[PDB]
């Protein structure tokens, strides 16, 4: 029985299946769990919505193309509109959570191509215009994929998204130090990374701080031949885990 290629993940009213996985990466060896009485600082009772928050949210999926350079999403911000997680994040000064990230991409024995799927903590990105500063709308489109550029330039306060430097002044080939998997179309149809709350402080504001960035970068370009299905998307579905919130007031932004 039990082929290790087959997997079923259930969280809240959500189940994802896969019949071609390559194990699952638990970020830095640590499974997500709630903030403990020793490590706590905000004295108020936390609200823990469990199944209502901690469930599988499918974000707007992107199309993989032969020349398409790459994509990033920012968490928790990508989830700012995803159901009751978004609401809780909107009505609370502080929030804390880990996440099951599940990237999906299927093609065929006859297709080829390989993408890096990585969760980078504190991926603080550089301004394209080195002289100037970057700004939110060029840092995150919430649940919509921000694209990496093959082109070394961009519009006013856009990030320097030139792929080989991963938007942050380093070698993209070294991104592998962060919790990652690869969807190599020969081998698998999905990636799964279970990311713990990685931060220097027990809870933080859900909007101000992008705790980590999901980067999907094609290291080997998507390819196939003579009339063999052009459209092949990449879908990212993510589930919050052990989510708890402190400091409640009115609807929040400013």
């Amino acid at each position: 029985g039990y082929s290790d290629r087959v997997r079923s993940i259930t969280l809240g009213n959500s189940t994802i299946t896969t019949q071609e996985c390559a194990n699952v990466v638990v970020g830095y060896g640590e499974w997500p769990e709630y903030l403990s009485d020793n490590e706590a600082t905000a004295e108020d009772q936390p609200t823990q919505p469990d199944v209502a928050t901690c469930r599988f949210y499918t974000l707007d999926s992107v199309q993989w193309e032969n020349g398409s350079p790459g994509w990033w999403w920012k968490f928790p911000d990508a989830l700012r509109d995803m159901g009751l997680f978004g609401q809780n994040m909107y009505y609370h000064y502080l929030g804390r959570a880990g996440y099951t990230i599940h990237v999906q991409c299927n093609a065929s024995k006859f297709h080829q191509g390989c993408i890096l799927v990585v969760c980078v903590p504190e991926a603080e990105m550089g301004s394209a215009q080195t002289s100037g500063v970057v700004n939110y709308e060029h840092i995150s489109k919430g649940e919509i994929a921000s694209r990496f550029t093959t082109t070394t330039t961009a519009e006013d306060h856009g990030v320097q998204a030139a792929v080989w430097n991963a938007g942050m002044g380093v070698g993209v080939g070294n991104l592998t130090i962060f919790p990652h998997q690869w969807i190599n179309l020969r081998t698998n149809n999905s990636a799964t990374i279970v990311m713990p709350y990685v931060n220097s402080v027990p809870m933080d504001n859900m909007y101000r701080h992008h705790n980590f960035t999901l980067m999907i970068i094609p290291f080997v370009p998507l390819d196939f031949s003579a009339g063999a299905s052009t459209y092949v998307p990449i879908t990212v579905t993510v589930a919050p885990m052990c989510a708890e919130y402190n400091g409640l007031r009115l609807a929040g932004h400013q």
Binding site: Y2, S3, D4, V6, R7, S8, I9, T10, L11, G12, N13, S14, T15, T17, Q19, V24, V51, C54, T100, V194
Partner: protein
Amino acid sequence: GDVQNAVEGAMVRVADTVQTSATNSERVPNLTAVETGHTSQAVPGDTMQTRHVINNHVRSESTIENFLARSACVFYLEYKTGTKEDSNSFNNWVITTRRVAQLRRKLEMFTYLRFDMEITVVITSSQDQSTSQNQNAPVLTHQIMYVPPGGPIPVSVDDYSWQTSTNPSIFWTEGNAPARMSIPFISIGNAYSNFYDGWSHFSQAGVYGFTTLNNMGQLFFRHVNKPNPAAITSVARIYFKPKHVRAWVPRPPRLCPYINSTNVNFEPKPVTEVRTNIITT
């Protein structure tokens, strides 16, 4: 269990919802193969995280007995008050399930059926219009006679056959409670057969189908009263209740309308009702 020993049951409730937690594993309860011929025994807790619910619901009325053991009309027959000369002074019915639409579809959901039966019969009378309809007509008694396959048919409203020296009969006066009998499992075979994909003759011929097996005999009806000056018409409704039931081989329920009481014929109908679009609200 003994379907004839009524006062001896078995209480079987529905299944409870066991609480499920989150999972991340190699076991796949909702990934399977229809090709197998197997139905998925999945429970909501294999796909969602469920709470703990105690289902004290019982599958009571869907029991074959509770489903079939409600007394249905199978046929009604008509006859006037008259003399030997009047053909219409008496009547008969060859016993059959397939005459009506409703009970027939219920029984036919099972290939083979074995049961005892409660027969109730509502005989109703009415005055014929006539110059003499003014008439003091006394209380009418009625005779229902079962003639099993082989016995003498009554040729008139008034012949030796109605003596019933061995045939079962019921004599019933009007105004009283409806006549009622119980019948054993009357068949020569180990179960009644609602369907027979076969022939009456060894040479693959003669009568095709269920007709061949279901030879139940017939019910003869008459008035026992001599005729009053103006005629009175009576109509007998025969009611059947399958009790002490056992059923074998479930079938799809009849989609097409019934055409003949003799055979299983149909003319082709659509699989379901049509809708506006494949995406519907």
